[PDB]
Amino acid sequence: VGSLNCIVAVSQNMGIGKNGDLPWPPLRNEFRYFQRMTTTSSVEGKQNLVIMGKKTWFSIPEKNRPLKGRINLVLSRELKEPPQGAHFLSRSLDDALKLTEQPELANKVDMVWIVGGSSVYKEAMNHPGHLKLFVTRIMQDFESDTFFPEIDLEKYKLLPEYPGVLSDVQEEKGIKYKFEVYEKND
């Protein structure tokens, strides 16, 4: 099992969600970036694992559930079994990470990607060990009801470039944004 990563897109006012949707209109290449980063495995024969909260799972359209080409895991303390279309369910991020060491997943999983929402990012960002944060900075304010926690810059470094990630400003539908990658070796 490989690296532990978070990936998120966040508006200038720290928003990630609104009424079960994204706060901004759909940004095709931001979606394509999310898909490619979380699907691409560095190891032949293996897939990446995506971990997500329950609300994030249900915010994905049923046609795109589970996220194709990745092993999906949902976090919830209320559900008694993984939701329809999912095969894994854990009570906490720590439980999910321990699950990756059992044979059913250790043989299959390369990278682990936390894909939201708010409380999952919070638990992950404080988790000890090596962690990278792939943060898309959406350079506008959008009305949101779900937010990304502020990054502790005493713990993380901001990398000027990361392989395969363009460092220049992007623009779609009149909205500019930028891909950032943070790292800690805690």
Ligand SMILES: NC(=O)c1ccc[n+]([C@@H]2O[C@H](COP(=O)([O-])OP(=O)(O)OC[C@H]3O[C@@H](n4cnc5c(N)ncnc54)[C@H](OP(=O)(O)O)[C@@H]3O)[C@@H](O)[C@H]2O)c1
């Ligand atoms: N912009 C982005 O990058 C991005 C990414 C993801 C989602 N989103 C948006 O954000 C919203 C969803 O995020 P959200 O923060 O509202 O919800 P969420 O974190 O996806 O789901 C929250 C629920 O998941 C369970 N849960 C979450 N963290 C847990 C943890 N660490 N351990 C155990 N259970 C945990 C709990 O369910 P139980 O009560 O059943 O225990 C909790 O009520 C939607 O609007 C979605 O569109 C945006």
Ligand SMILES: CCc1nc(N)nc(N)c1OCCCOc1ccccc1C[C@H](C(=O)O)C(F)F
């Ligand atoms: C692309 C957004 C994103 N961008 C970065 N950089 N990181 C993330 N974690 C992230 O959220 C991915 C999970 C939340 O998804 C959604 C939630 C509400 C509405 C639509 C989606 C996208 C769906 C999907 O995810 O496939 C669907 F289009 F299929």
Ligand SMILES: [Cl-]
């Ligand atoms: Cl921040």
